[PDB]
Amino acid sequence: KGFSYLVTATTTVGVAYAAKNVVSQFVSSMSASADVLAKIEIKLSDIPEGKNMAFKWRGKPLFVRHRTKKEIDQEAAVEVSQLRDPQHDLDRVKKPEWVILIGVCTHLGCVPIANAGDFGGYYCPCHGSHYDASGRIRKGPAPLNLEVPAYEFTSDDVVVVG
Amino acid sequence: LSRFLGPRYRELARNWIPTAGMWGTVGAVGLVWATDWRLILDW
Amino acid sequence: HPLFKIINHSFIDLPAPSNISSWWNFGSLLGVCLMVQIITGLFLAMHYTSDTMTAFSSVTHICRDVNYGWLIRYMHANGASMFFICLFLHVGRGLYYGSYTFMETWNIGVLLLFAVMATAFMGYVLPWGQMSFWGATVITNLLSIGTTLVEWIWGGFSVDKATLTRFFAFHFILPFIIAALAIVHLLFLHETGSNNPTGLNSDADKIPFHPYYTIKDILGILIMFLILMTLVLFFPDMLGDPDNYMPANPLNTPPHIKPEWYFLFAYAILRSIPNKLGGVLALILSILILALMPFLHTSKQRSLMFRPITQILYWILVANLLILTWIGGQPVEHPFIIIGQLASISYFSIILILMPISGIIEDKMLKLY
Amino acid sequence: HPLFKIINHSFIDLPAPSNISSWWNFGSLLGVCLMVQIITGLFLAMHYTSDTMTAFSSVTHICRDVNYGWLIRYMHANGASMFFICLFLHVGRGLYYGSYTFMETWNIGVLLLFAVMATAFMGYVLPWGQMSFWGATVITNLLSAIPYIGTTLVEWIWGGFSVDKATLTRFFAFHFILPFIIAA
Amino acid sequence: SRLYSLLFRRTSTFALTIAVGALFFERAFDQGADAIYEHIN
Amino acid sequence: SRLYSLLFRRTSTFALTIAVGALFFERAFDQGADAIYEHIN
Amino acid sequence: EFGNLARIRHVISYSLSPFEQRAFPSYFSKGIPNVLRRTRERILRVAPPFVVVYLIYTWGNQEFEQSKRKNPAMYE
Amino acid sequence: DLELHPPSYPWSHRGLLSSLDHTSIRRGFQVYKQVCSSCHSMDYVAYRHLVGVCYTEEEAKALAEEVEVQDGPNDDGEMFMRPGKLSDYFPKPYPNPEAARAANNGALPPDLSYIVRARHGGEDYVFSLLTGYCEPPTGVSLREGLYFNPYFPGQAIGMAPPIYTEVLEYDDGTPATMSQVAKDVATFLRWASEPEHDHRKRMGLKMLLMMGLLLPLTYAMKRHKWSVLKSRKLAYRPPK
Amino acid sequence: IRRGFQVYKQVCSSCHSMDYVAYRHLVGVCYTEEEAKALAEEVEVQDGPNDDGE
Amino acid sequence: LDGFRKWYYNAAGFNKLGLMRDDTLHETEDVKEAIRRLPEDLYNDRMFRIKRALDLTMRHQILPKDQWTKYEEDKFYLEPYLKEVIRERKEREEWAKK
Amino acid sequence: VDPLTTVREHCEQLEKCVKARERLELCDNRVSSRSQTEEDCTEELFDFLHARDHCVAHKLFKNL
């Protein structure tokens, strides 16, 4: 019996190894192709205080915003610990007058709408997530604060975000 | 549910238990290997 | 002939209850709608291009340059709407008359319902309008092993051409799987035969199907075609969204994002639960609660024809399903939210708790319990 | 169980002759080849575009940028060739051993053969190479032989004066839809 | 004979041995095969 | 009664009357319908 | 399958040919009474949920409006 | 949202079988050609579309040949412009949307081909917007390149009011009052967003006549084949 | 293959095109990524339209 | 209480179709067994009652109110047979449990 | 020379119109009186506009 079954067990592993391989490539086919798998330009002067701007960096809205004395003042006043996501305004900005965020709602990925909402920052018309000027989720069902790309303040009027 | 899980049935529960665990184990090994779950494979 | 004999056994001469009402037409209508969708879909596929540069242009070319191409496109869209109308009434018939005790037929049904919802979602993504793209992004992230799965489906960082083309392939291929699952649905039923509105054993009174429930299905097909063509030829945009007639702008987000009306009940539930995950789960349960339905039947009577308290609970369930459909439409603000939260609580409590307790009470009233 | 009864009735407890040679394998191979083609065809359909500006570009993108896309494309092409090898040997088995006396099975077979040839022809038109373009033209005009509607038919199928995008897109739709009719 | 009585007679164990073996077989096969391909080219 | 015995009793003739009638019905329907549509608009 | 469906005995079922009977016997004669009979056996079970849906819908709309209406006391 | 839902107007095509007034579509095409074509595009409406509709083949022909169209680089890599053909689409105002952003103070004038279909209550909206450039009230202030149009979302449309009474002269001579012009261009834009409006309604009329013929007849056939049972009289006669 | 790519770049690229072979293809054993990056940046391919519009 | 029960009986409406409570019980194996144990008279009568109901339903009509079974008129004929079947089933089940 | 303005003119005569207009006046002064208030009158005007426009249209295309 052990001779005959060992052959059944041997064969199985072999088939099993081929079957995982065939199924693996197929599964892999639907994964990102080489083209997609394979730069940024911003101008600080472009935005004045109290305004947001996006350049669709990497296929997603690259929110770039300037903040006012008051704007910058309130965000700091916000309770970091009490924040849904503990990230003080300055924690996400190299410049208080300058805040840069990625526009994908932590919740289901819509575009937050700038200059709307109950927290003077953002609002996502999809499910009602209100982000403060810091892009921190303050009210609603959005899980985490908007992401801050690792940008570069190239110049007083120029920026290279990531 | 004693109809299919009476005192006598418990006996059968334990009687079959070992086999059940074996089957889960087989599936576990498979998942790890097939999906290349690497958290478990790495060990 | 063997096949004809097989057909005769299944269609020409299949014993059927003599007293089934017009509601029993609806499933046959669904099959007709499926064929209609497939036929119209095939005639959309001879001119549609699944490229993000040319998808909107191909849809406008269908509407403007193909001979009667606007007719086939709006027949396809309003036939999807008619499919969901007939699907909801079919499910409501199954819930009201106790037809869920045919458990295998019910489970193949809820599988068909999931497949039809996925097909309609990807089909609505297909014209690549403003509304299609924004809705698409939302649902995919709903999946977020979450992150990986979302990215897999999208086929990239964010929905883009990669998605559109695979959504065209999947939207093409799933209605044939729906047809095969419908064949399995018909098989799992003939083994048991159809139910009647009284819920009793109708073996003493059965009639043929060819001359009695065929001309009835033909009349129902004619009435459904009347409603479909008055939806297409007179009010072709009363059920769609105007913002889908704009091209897909990733930079511009719409002020209010909706799926199409038949997803609304679910949309409401999702929005209601504060937790994202909770919403997704509840949403799923919303559809799945039905599958769970044959294990909740605690009455000694199959149908609701002789059960008035559970009839009242059923019509309250239809009422707050309509309420959840309305809420989904309403924006996020008081008091739409609270209604949504209650309506969802009432929906799950009526299906899970109130109907079996009411069936126990009804059995107690007839000196059965 | 009414679903397992048919599966048992056609694959497990089916009484088969004990002495059938390896040639009787071939029809089952054809069924496997059909699925293989369908599966590979589905994974070609997630990246192929049926536009005359972009069809060749999409095929090269499948071969060069999709992960193992060259594998699925050449599996599809050589699986069509393997399908016709198994089909010819299946028909030769039917001719040699007198299996054509099963007349209904034989007639459904020759209908399947016509459908498979039409599917392979339109599939070969689909990559929109130099060969594909002219070949399609010839066969559409092959219809022209018809005395009255020959031209009209050719016009109809072509969808225009000469094969052009109009054809490619409807050939993509028909090549997609016919293997499911072949399965039925 | 021991193996049969231990890992190949109980179907559950039969599956276990198959799955586990397959899990490692890939490692060995890939490694061995690659060695060969490299040597060839 | 004559019609039944002449064109509606033999199925072949039943089909004949149907087909022929349909052939002309289109002419009449289209004509009549168009008149109405035009009058309306 | 017709035949061998169930055991039925000692029953007499009379019927008439379609062409021998009027197509719409007393269609509006009794149809109306019956339809009305029907509506009065089911209206109390069906209608009041949809009535309170109408009240909740209107309420929501009006409440929403009032919600939107500016607070006069505010900003003054 | 926060805007006056445009009041419905008694349009001549508002009825269930009511077609479009084609003289109004011709006048609205003239309004688009002389006013709206400077900023807005009509990418899915070729000159041929006009043919047979308020304009003939030759009528459109002269209209198409009034403009010039780059017909590609030919065979000498020579991008060149030619008089428009009945097959030519309507000319672009700008080669790309970023030029529209640069020329319209950062705002993008949208495609007016499907504007009526894309705007909720479009026909009304259009009319209202074009005729709704009222003065901003106290408390609201708009920046340059903005105008208080109650109907426009936000009431701040970059588009300046384009229809001043007697902005253009109708060839038909119908007084070119601002309104007469807004109604004509709303009819035309409507036509644009649905060139088949008329043909369809004809189909719908034929469909209503055919269903009014066929529904009672199929009902009569069903009630024939179901009368047999509906007259069946059952009697229980236990042998007793 | 590296030598033949050099042959194509210096001789064959004046008349013949390689529309389906991006510099992405260059990356590999014959040409490493930054080898490729310098090879790609030797040329100055028009990116396309500008925000200005050109 | 029973007054309401009679009202509920009326509510059930099987009286409108002359359906004994037992007639209404949705068929179940236990019910079927009890039905099998039923004497022919009851069986035959039950059949006609059921058949009648379906026909009435087919025509969307109800029996004359007077023909309607009264709350008092309704009889639990199958009740006892069912009781026996159930008890037996319970016994066997317990035997199995133990 | 605008029938629309004439329609509006007749609309002006409408009493409902004046009522809404009155409210607008109150707020305009209200806003002015409140040196630093973001209390706008779009709220009020919109209301006025609706009635005015709604009536205007009622008798606007017919006049057109």
Ligand SMILES: CCCCCCCCCCCCCCCCCC(=O)OC[C@H](COP(=O)(O)OCCN)OC(=O)CCCCCCCCCCCCCCCCC
């Ligand atoms: C006590 C009954 C008194 C009846 C007096 C009328 C005269 C009776 C004698 C003459 C005969 C007239 C015609 C009879 C027709 C059939 C019989 C009938 O109508 O019976 C009454 C019916 C059934 O009574 P029963 O079910 O026993 O009552 C339990 C109540 N839960 O019960 C009803 O119809 C009552 C239905 C009330 C339903 C109220 C629902 C309120 C809540 C709706 C919520 C909807 C969703 C809200 C939003 C949720 C999310 C925010």
Ligand code: HEC
């Ligand atoms: C001829 C009389 C017309 C008609 C019927 C319309 N316009 Fe224009 N338009 C222009 C610009 C720069 C914009 C965008 C402004 C902004 O988005 O802020 C528009 C916009 C429109 C719309 C869309 C309104 C909406 O809600 O999106 C519509 C329906 C519309 N217009 C109608 C510029 C111009 C012109 C250059 C000065 C002129 C001429 C026209 N438009 C003319 C017309």
Ligand code: HEM
């Ligand atoms: C296999 C058969 C089918 C094919 C080939 C098919 C193909 C298509 C194509 C090409 C489109 C895009 C054209 C358009 O914008 O209308 C489309 C749209 C759509 N399809 Fe299908 N389809 C099929 C079956 C179905 C079914 C069964 C449903 C219903 C669940 C459905 C629902 C939709 C919807 C909702 C749209 C969007 C319509 C819109 O633009 O508003 N399709 N389909």
Ligand code: HEM
């Ligand atoms: C894809 C769409 C569907 C099609 C084409 C379909 C088709 C059919 C058909 C032809 C019948 C027989 C005729 C009839 O009784 O109406 C039927 C009956 C039935 N279907 Fe479906 N069905 C669909 C969806 C569903 C769903 C979603 C469910 C589950 C909720 C379901 C459950 C049932 C049940 C329980 C019956 C038995 C009816 C009875 O005897 O009372 N079906 N279906």
Ligand code: HEM
């Ligand atoms: C429904 C399932 C199928 C789908 C979706 C499908 C889809 C496609 C697609 C997209 C292509 C173009 C990609 C390419 O150039 O290879 C193609 C090519 C082709 N297909 Fe299919 N196909 C299917 C089934 C079949 C079958 C059953 C046959 C055999 C009769 C077949 C024969 C071919 C051939 C010969 C080509 C040309 C391959 C080449 O470029 O050399 N296909 N198919």
